Amino acid sequence: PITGLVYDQRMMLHHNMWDSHHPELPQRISRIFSRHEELRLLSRCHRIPARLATEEELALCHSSKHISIIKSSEHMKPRDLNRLGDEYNSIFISNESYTCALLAAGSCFNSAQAILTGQVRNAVAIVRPPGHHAEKDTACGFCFFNTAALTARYAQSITRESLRVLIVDWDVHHGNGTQHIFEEDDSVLYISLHRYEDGAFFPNSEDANYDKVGLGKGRGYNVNIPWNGGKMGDPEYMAAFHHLVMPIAREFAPELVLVSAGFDAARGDPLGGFQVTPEGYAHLTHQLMSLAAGRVLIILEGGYNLTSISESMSMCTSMLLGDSPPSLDHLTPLKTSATVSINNVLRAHAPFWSSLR
Numbered sequence: 001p002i003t004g005l006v007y008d009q010r011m012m013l014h015h016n017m018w019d020s021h022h023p024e025l026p027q028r029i030s031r032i033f034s035r036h037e038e039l040r041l042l043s044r045c046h047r048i049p050a051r052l053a054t055e056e057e058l059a060l061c062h063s064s065k066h067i068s069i070i071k072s073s074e075h076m077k078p079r080d081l082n083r084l085g086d087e088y089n090s091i092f093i094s095n096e097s098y099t100c101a102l103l104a105a106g107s108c109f110n111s112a113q114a115i116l117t118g119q120v121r122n123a124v125a126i127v128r129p130p131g132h133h134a135e136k137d138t139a140c141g142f143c144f145f146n147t148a149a150l151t152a153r154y155a156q157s158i159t160r161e162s163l164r165v166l167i168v169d170w171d172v173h174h175g176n177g178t179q180h181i182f183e184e185d186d187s188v189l190y191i192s193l194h195r196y197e198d199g200a201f202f203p204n205s206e207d208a209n210y211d212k213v214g215l216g217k218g219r220g221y222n223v224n225i226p227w228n229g230g231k232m233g234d235p236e237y238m239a240a241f242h243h244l245v246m247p248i249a250r251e252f253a254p255e256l257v258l259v260s261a262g263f264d265a266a267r268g269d270p271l272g273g274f275q276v277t278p279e280g281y282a283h284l285t286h287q288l289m290s291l292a293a294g295r296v297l298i299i300l301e302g303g304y305n306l307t308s309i310s311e312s313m314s315m316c317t318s319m320l321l322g323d324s325p326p327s328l329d330h331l332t333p334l335k336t337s338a339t340v341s342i343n344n345v346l347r348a349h350a351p352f353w354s355s356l357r
């Protein structure tokens with residue numbers, strides 16, 4: 001099979017001991033997996049096994065202190081788990097959390113390996129907990145280790161240090177961790193689309209604004225597309241891809257594409273409040289398949305409406321498998337503030353990308 005799929009039910013074990021209804025539910029991944037079975041997608045994929053990341057692999061992006069603190073939670077008593085989790089912004093921890101975070105990362109390493117060794121062309125990773133808010137030295141926003149960032153470094157470690165990796169982060173939240181890890185790096189192009197609301201939207205930092213273009217040799221290699229003042233959906237995401245994501249990506253000419261694929265911009269998501277449709281996600285996936293000779297790895301991040309994420313991620317897998325993509329309306333006018341956002345990013349990045357000039 002041309003498309004790989006990784007899913008391990010052991011990643012369900014991470015749970016919130018004090019609020020069993022917290023939206024980052026174990027069943028997020030099992031529901032997505034079940035939908036792949038219902039739609040007969042699973043048997044069309046080559047099944048890639050999950051594995052644990054090693055501590056040496058975590059050190060590709062994370063400090064020894066951070067690794068050690070999260071590792072220490074594996075045998076903590078409940079009171080200590082509660083106290084430790086409360087030291088971070090929006091984290092809960094159970095004794096299974098560390099191992100689940102290792103499995104999420106190792107699953108993605110095995111998927112990247114399968115792509116880069118030619119065993120599969122592309123792949124999807126149905127993993128939790130998510131990764132993109134995790135920083136070198138801290139956990140944040142339901143994330144412990146930065147799975148996508150680690151996977152970029154892991155990919156480089158089996159090919160070449162300078163292997164060009166594009167990370168497209170279409171989760172509705174800004175991947176602050178990923179931005180920071182690669183901020184000074186021109187080998188990893190980070191492009192995030194995210195709700196911003198001038199800082200009112202999590203993670204509530206001006207680091208997510210369009211004027212953060214990267215640092216030093218990384219200038220130009222961090223592209224933030226922030227949305228303000230409007231319920232964005234397919235038209236806006238399509239326009240961002242047309243004017244920004246795809247021209248920059250084609251110029252960068254990645255050798256591997258990782259998608260930080262949260263489905264919390266989806267219609268029905270309680271945290272995102274946006275209206276991207278499953279066909280919208282299919283369109284975006286199919287666009288990214290035109291890059292890197294098709295070498296695309298879709299990594300689950302956020303997304304909290306169980307039916308919505310199941311349908312949306314399954315449509316992405318369908319695209320990876322070669323199914324016919326959707327024809328959507330590129331003429332629908334955008335929300336006025338979306339035009340402003342796109343124009344702000346264009347102005348910020350035109351100094352770095354000839355495709356924008």
Ligand SMILES: O=C(CCCCCCC(=O)Nc1ccccc1)NO
Nearest residue numbers: 023090141142171173202271302303
């Ligand atoms: O999807 C995410 C999760 C980021 C963490 C969001 C914290 C703020 C928030 O919306 N918290 C929340 C909302 C409803 C119920 C429980 C927590 N990142 O991509």
Ligand SMILES: [Cl-]
Nearest residue numbers: 035038039311
């Ligand atoms: Cl159906």
Ligand SMILES: [Cl-]
Nearest residue numbers: 040041042043
């Ligand atoms: Cl199947």
Ligand SMILES: [Cl-]
Nearest residue numbers: 343344347348
């Ligand atoms: Cl501007």
Ligand SMILES: [K+]
Nearest residue numbers: 169171173193
């Ligand atoms: K994002």
Ligand SMILES: [K+]
Nearest residue numbers: 182185188221
């Ligand atoms: K970068």
Ligand SMILES: [Mg+2]
Nearest residue numbers: 220221352353
């Ligand atoms: Mg450049």
Ligand SMILES: [Zn+2]
Nearest residue numbers: 171173262302
């Ligand atoms: Zn999110």
